[PDB]
Amino acid sequence: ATGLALETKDGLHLFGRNMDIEYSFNQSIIFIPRNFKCVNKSNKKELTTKYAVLGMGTIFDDYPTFADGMNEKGLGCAGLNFPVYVSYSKEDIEGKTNIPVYNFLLWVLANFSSVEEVKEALKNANIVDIPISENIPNTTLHWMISDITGKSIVVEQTKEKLNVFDNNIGVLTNSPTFDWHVANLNQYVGLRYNQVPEFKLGDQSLTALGQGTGLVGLPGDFTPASRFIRVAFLRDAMIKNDKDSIDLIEFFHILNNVAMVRGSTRTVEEKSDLTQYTSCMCLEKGIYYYNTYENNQINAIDMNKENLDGNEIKTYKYNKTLSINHVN
Amino acid sequence: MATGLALETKDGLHLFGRNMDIEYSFNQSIIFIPRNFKCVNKSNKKELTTKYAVLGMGTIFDDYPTFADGMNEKGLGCAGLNFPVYVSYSKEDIEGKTNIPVYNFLLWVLANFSSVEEVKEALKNANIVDIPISENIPNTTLHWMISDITGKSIVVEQTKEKLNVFDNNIGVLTNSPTFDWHVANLNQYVGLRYNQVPEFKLGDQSLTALGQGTGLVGLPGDFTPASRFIRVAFLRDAMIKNDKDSIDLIEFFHILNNVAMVRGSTRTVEEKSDLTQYTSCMCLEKGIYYYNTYENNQINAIDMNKENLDGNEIKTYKYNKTLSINHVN
Amino acid sequence: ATGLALETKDGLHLFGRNMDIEYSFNQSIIFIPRNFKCVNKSNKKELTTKYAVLGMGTIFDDYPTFADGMNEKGLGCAGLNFPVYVSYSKEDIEGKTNIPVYNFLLWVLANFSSVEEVKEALKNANIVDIPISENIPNTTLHWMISDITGKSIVVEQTKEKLNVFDNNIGVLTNSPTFDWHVANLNQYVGLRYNQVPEFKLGDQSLTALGQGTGLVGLPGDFTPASRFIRVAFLRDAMIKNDKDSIDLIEFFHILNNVAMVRGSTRTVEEKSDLTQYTSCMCLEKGIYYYNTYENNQINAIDMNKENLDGNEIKTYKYNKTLSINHVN
Amino acid sequence: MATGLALETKDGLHLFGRNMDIEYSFNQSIIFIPRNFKCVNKSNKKELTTKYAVLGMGTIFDDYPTFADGMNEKGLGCAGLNFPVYVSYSKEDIEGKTNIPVYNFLLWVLANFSSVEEVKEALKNANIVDIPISENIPNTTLHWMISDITGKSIVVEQTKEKLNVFDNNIGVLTNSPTFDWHVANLNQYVGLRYNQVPEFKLGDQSLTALGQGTGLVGLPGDFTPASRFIRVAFLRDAMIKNDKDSIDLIEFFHILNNVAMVRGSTRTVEEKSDLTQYTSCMCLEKGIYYYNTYENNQINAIDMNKENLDGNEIKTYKYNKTLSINHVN
Incomplete structure (x- = not known):
């Protein structure tokens, strides 16, 4: 999993991710309108949205859980895998604003409008290991959050406390911790x-027998560390040299370089680990762009072309059918 | 430029194409030539009448077509890749050999021959001569990859000594050094x-292990011809070894996306950004030319069978640089 | 700078270091007998040795400061460079056992006999930035400590607190922090x-066209991180496959691989950074083995061939004259 | 095996030697042969009378010497390094050429010739034949490096086509692939x-920067011939570029120490540890053979000028495997 934040040639902010998994998680694009009550059947917990939400995720017993998404105010959040260094409390902690793992992403997007607003609430916050449903265990996760100011933060709960790092790199991957990667x-x-x-x-x-000799030493593998390195320097290079040329497609070019290809990354269960989908959220315009492994054409869902004061959850079929333009 | 790739789908169709890695535009379009079309070079009066119909990427100077990569109706595909040094073109013609200009080599292969085996035999007494397409446009240092519907591919490189015709059991190609160097690497x-x-x-x-892909640690990440060669070779092999039954059109693109140059990170000495301008993929059996670009990542299809193969006009199609978004709602 | 701990084929423990610097620091081998009072002229601070000390260092106004050394009980300590992540307090901290930076190494060796003894005292300890003499500023340092039990620890004072890591890797280098390297x-x-x-x-x-194909991916450069990687895996390989063959010379073979060669590592001041000397301490036997860049023959100083109840400091001339054995 | 190195000291003396990287012992000793000594191979009755005095590392089977690396009184040095594939010895003799056995090539160079230029001319009509030193001891696949007091070095590799004699402007050598591959790499x-x-x-x-040496990031750390070749080449260059005036005997050892194999980390398929058994350094002008071993790292000197160069006996010296410690107190 790779997370990316970018600024276009005309002021707009792009925030998205690569989802790298060997399986499907029954994912679909999920739209939630303003003032929508969500009740978890398993633990009777309630959440009413203050802002409209749009992003990728799945639904259990009418309860929406997100992998990544954005709200109407231009706040974006992405949940990436965090294998060993993560630490959740098994029960609630008194005083702290306790948040269930599966629900953290929605909690950020439904309640707050800016990165700063999230920063403040997260000072007295804690992630509790309570599953969405009894036999649906939570995954090891850490989040990247970004808004229309161009600023991004990183949420990582270790054994010590809940850490909120300022992301001046503009990217996130997976384990080890964020400070490890920045030092690396x-x-x-x-x-x-x-x-x-x-x-x-x-x-x-x-x-020199070809171009790109000055980059010799860059790691080519698809580990979280190497992918962090590539995506950070590819991003830097583009800002430095070609800031005036940064549009929607450039976001995908950077992430494609760190995308997992079928066959090369095999798990111990002998499954091929793929970049199943790549999403990109234009925060100002409220558009969820994405493409999949099967279908590479960018698909756009606009939340402003929906009724933000609506009464129902709107879903969109995950596009895994290749779309070709026939020229003649 | 470049990266060349050959691949066999689950249905047993043969894909052959390439990445084009240049820092500019060479005013290219997709060119189509029907059967028995007489191509007349106006600068040096040399004729070419095509035996088979031809389709691929290239450019036209003074009514005369020249290709960067293409294929014919018979399922023979050829691609022209950059070859900085290690290449020596004969300044003047050679007696007894089949003298072929640099610009004209690609079309020569596609217009006259149907199979790789047919090309191999014809290349035994062949030489590449350094004659320009016009007066002011000099020849680029090139080396070629030729593939067909059998699944076999060859690499053609002219060195100072002789014109080499390697067998390509790797199915890939980039640039300098020579092919035999890359195989050893x-x-x-x-x-x-x-x-x-x-x-x-x-x-x-x-x-x-912190995450996935620990076995491939040591793989180079840069965009040099050699590093690109290694990545594309092993990524390919991995897909054949583990997922032979899932190979289709888009798999071709995923492999080349990894060795694709990104804006800003590959800077020429003339301070310009080197990019993978376009990625083409030719389905040899079906005669369909698929391609996307740096600007527009949607695959565009140009079927040659939809045209009159017994036509009397060279037909062109505009090079797509406008992003095609699918608006879901 | 590289630190190494090793166990011979016959139970003995070897602990030493590579000193990687672009200059000389007026170094010599220094011997201190039992019950020896040391008075710093600059700040009037006092220290009387409980145990005899032998190691490499220099002397300012009759005050000994060490780069690395051992005591009579088999405790060894090495002080390696720690550029940016180090943090000393400018003044003493109440309650804590405050130790001046220049004096930390001697404080460990003079007072304690075992790693465990040091661990306990370090719980209420703090490193204070007080110079040996007014215009001789302290360097950025972190220490590796090992004894005859085979166990090693790592002392690193950050901005937060004084950290004592268990070194189960058997090696130490330089920045970043120890936990970063272990994760790397x-x-x-x-x-x-x-x-x-x-x-x-x-x-x-x-x-394969040669041997050592299974190690492709190993970094060859002389940065602290790469040298940490090489020395850790070279050590591991030897323990796993050739434990019965580990003697004194094997210690040098491992460290030679990470040794800096003249010309290749140039500082911004245009000086060549060299592995000036390589020391190795046989903790059980109380022998200081070492060789230099100019002279590669192992030189041995035995502390038990000195009067441990003596009255004076004994020094030994740093050997930088190549010694060749003439066969005929 | 191996790594070969040539270097010029501040005083303008020429050092030539090598690392020997084998996982065993080949019963070696330092061999000395005086002028006009008749070496008689008992297995195949072939004669060799030396023109110049010879000194170097090797072994003796049936009163006949064979070298792994050595030098003569004239300051010509030669080293034999492993060359797994890419080498083809002629099974039988070749008509017209100078047929030289594999085991005998090293001594042939040192006994008959004084300079590299003299060797080059003689190698024009030369061939290496696959004749064993005895019946049961087969020839190892080898390639050689020859250097002299001028500062010039050559690489001699026999391929299937011809016997190549490269110029060595890098001053280094390892093993497979071929020399020209390594230069391109x-x-x-x-x-x-x-x-x-x-x-x-x-x-x-x-x-x-966390520490020093950030510019050399990307350098390979492993012990393959290629990775060792790159390290030794650039480390050398760096020392000449920045510290030309500090080059002396021990600098030669520091360079080779970096590409020296360590016990345990290089495991053969026969589960044995591959080590840098010995490192030799020949001062060509002075005729002194310096060397250390894996067991004993102190440099041992054997001066050939201290011997009677007009002697009638082959003289040997025991291979030192006992660590020499200097007890200061």
Whole structure:
């Protein structure tokens, strides 16, 4: 799983993700209008949305849970895998605003409008390991949150406390912790985007045989660490050199580089780990762009073309049928 | 440029295409040439009458077509990839050989021959000469990949000594150094593993895998011809080994997406961004030319069978640079 | 700077280091006998040794400061560079056992006999930034401590508190923090010591053209992180496969691999960064083995061949003259 | 095996030697042969009378010497390194050529020739034949490096087609693939920097160097012939570029120590540990053979000028495997 935040040539903010899994999770695009009451049948817990929500997820006993999404105010949140360094409390903690793991994403999007608003509420917050339904256990997760100011934060609950890191890298991946990755970036300060044409090795002259010689040392594998490295420097390079050319498609070019291909990443259960879908949320415009592994054409769902004061949940069929434009 | 790829689908169809990695636009369009079309080079008066119908990406200077990558009606496909050094074109013609200009080699293969085996025989007494398409447009240093409906592919490189015709059992191609160098370089990566390594007992310390893809650690991530060659070769192999039965059109694109250049991270000495301008994919049996671009990632299809193969006009199609979004609601 | 701990084929414990610097620090081997009073002229601070000390260091106004050394009871300590993540308090902290940076190494060796003894005292301890002399500022440091039990710890004072990590890796380098390096090891679980002879790449057969194919992916550079990786896996490989063959010279073979060579590592001041010396302490026998960049022959100083109840500091000239054995 | 290295000291003396990377012992000792010594192979009755005095590492089977690496009185040095594939020895003799057995090539160079230029000319009509030193001891697949007091070095590799004699402007050598492959592989690492990169501004995030040697990130750390070749080549270059005036005997060892194999980390398929058994260094002008071992790291010197160069006996010296400690007190 890879998370990305970007700013277009005309002020707009793009925030999305790569979902990297070896399976399906019955996912669909889910729309929730303003003032919508949600009741969990299992534990009788209630949530009424203050803002309209649009994102990817699934529904259990009429209860919506999200993998990533955005609200009407331009706040976006993505839930990425966090294998070993995560730590949830099994029961509620007194004083703290206790949030069930499955419900954290919705809680961010339904209640708040800005990154700052989320920051403040998260000071007295705690993630509790209570499942959505009794035999549907919570997954190991950590979240990236971004808004229309261009600022992004990272939520990671360790054994010590709930950490809210400022994300000045603009990207998130998976384990280890965020501070580990930021420090790991220092190991790669020798990388150069500019072409290195020649090298004088004494009597022998060494000439570059192709482009991209200045990046030799970049890891090519699909581990969380390597993917963090690639996506961070690819992003940096684009901002530095081609800021005026950043539009919707550039978001996908960066993430495609860290996308898992069928066959190359095999689990111990002998399944192929794929980048099943890539989403991108235009926060200002309230549009959920996404494409899948089977169908690469960008599909757009606009929340402003729905009734935000509606009474029902609207869902959209996950598109896994390749769409080709026939020229002749 | 470039990365070349050949692949066999679950239904047993053969896909052959390429990435084009240049930092500019060469005014390209998709060119179609019918059977028995006489192509007249106005600069040097050289004729070419096509035996088979031809379709692919290229450009036209003075009514004369030249290809970067294409295919014919017989399911023979050819792609032209950059080859900086290690290539020597004969300045003047050679006596006894079949003298073929650099710009014209690609069309020569597609217009005259139906199969790879037919090309191999004809290339025994062949030479590539350094004659420009016009006066002011010099020839680019090129090397080619040719594939057909049998599943076999060849690499054609002209060195100072001779014109080499390698067998391509890897199914891939990039750029300099020579093909034989790249094959030998694969041996460095015999320790790569597609399977997950979950743990390692470091004496007293237990090391557990942080995420997926630990076996492929050591793979290069950069965009040099060599590093791109290794990635595309092993990614391909992995898909054949584990998922032979799921190979289809879009799998071709996923493989090449990994070795695709991104804006900003590959900067030429003339401070310009090198990008994967377009990715083409030719379904050889069906004669359909699929392609997307850096600007528009939707695959566009151009079927040559929908045209009159006995026509008398070269037909072109505009190069799509406008993103095609599907508005769901 | 690289630190290493090892166990011989016959029970003995070897602990030492690589000193990687672009300069000289007027270093010499320093011997201190039992019950020796040390008075700092600058700040009038006092220290009387409970145990005899032997190690590498220098002397300012009759005050000894150590880079690495051991005591008579078999406790060893090495002080390695810790650039950015270190944090010393400028003044003393009440309650805590405040220790000046320059004096920490001696404080460990003079007062305690075992790793456990040091662990206990370090619970209420703090490192204070007080210089040895007014214009001789303290360096950014973190320490590895090991004894005759085979156990090793790592002392790192961050902004939060004083951390004592259990070193089950048997090695130490430089920044980032120890927990960062231990986590970074997970990225390299795919490494194999065993030869990978062939690979079936479909119709093409790939055959190994030399030995050591299973290690492809190992970093070759001389950064603290890469050197941590190499030295940790080289150590592991030796324990696993050739435990019965581990003697004194094996210690040097491991560290030589991570040793800096003249010319390759240039500082911003255009100086060549070298592995100036490599020390190795046989903790049981009380022998300080070491060799330098100029002279590679192992030189041995035995503390038991000195008067441990003596009255003076004994020093030994740092050997930088190559010693060759003439066979004929 | 192996890694070969040539280096020029501050005083202008020429050092040539090698690492030997085998997982066993081949009963080796330092062999000395005086002028005009007749070496008689008892198995196949072939003669060799030396023109110059010879010294180096090797072994003796049936009173006949064979070298792994050595030098002569004239300052010509030669080393034999492993060459798994890409080498083809002629099974039987070739008509017209100078037929030289594999085991005998090293001594042939040192006994008959004084300079590299003299060797080059003689190698024009030369061939390496696959004749064993005895009946039951087969020839190892080898390739050689020859250097002299001029500072010039050559690489000699016999392929299926011809006997190649490359110029060595890198001053280094390892093993398979061929020399020309390794030279081309250096081009992949043009972005390596000996100088420290202190910082990198990643937009909003400031990245500062954790330690020293950030420019050389991307360098391979493993012990394959290729990875060893790259490290030894650039480490050498760095020392010449920045510290030309500090080059002396021990600098030779520091360079090779980096590409030296450590016990346990290089495991053969026969589950044995591959080690750098010995590291030799020949001072060509002075005729002194310096060497250390895996067991004893102290450099041992054997001066050939201290012997009677007009002697009538082959003289040997025991291979030192006992650690030499200097007891200070």
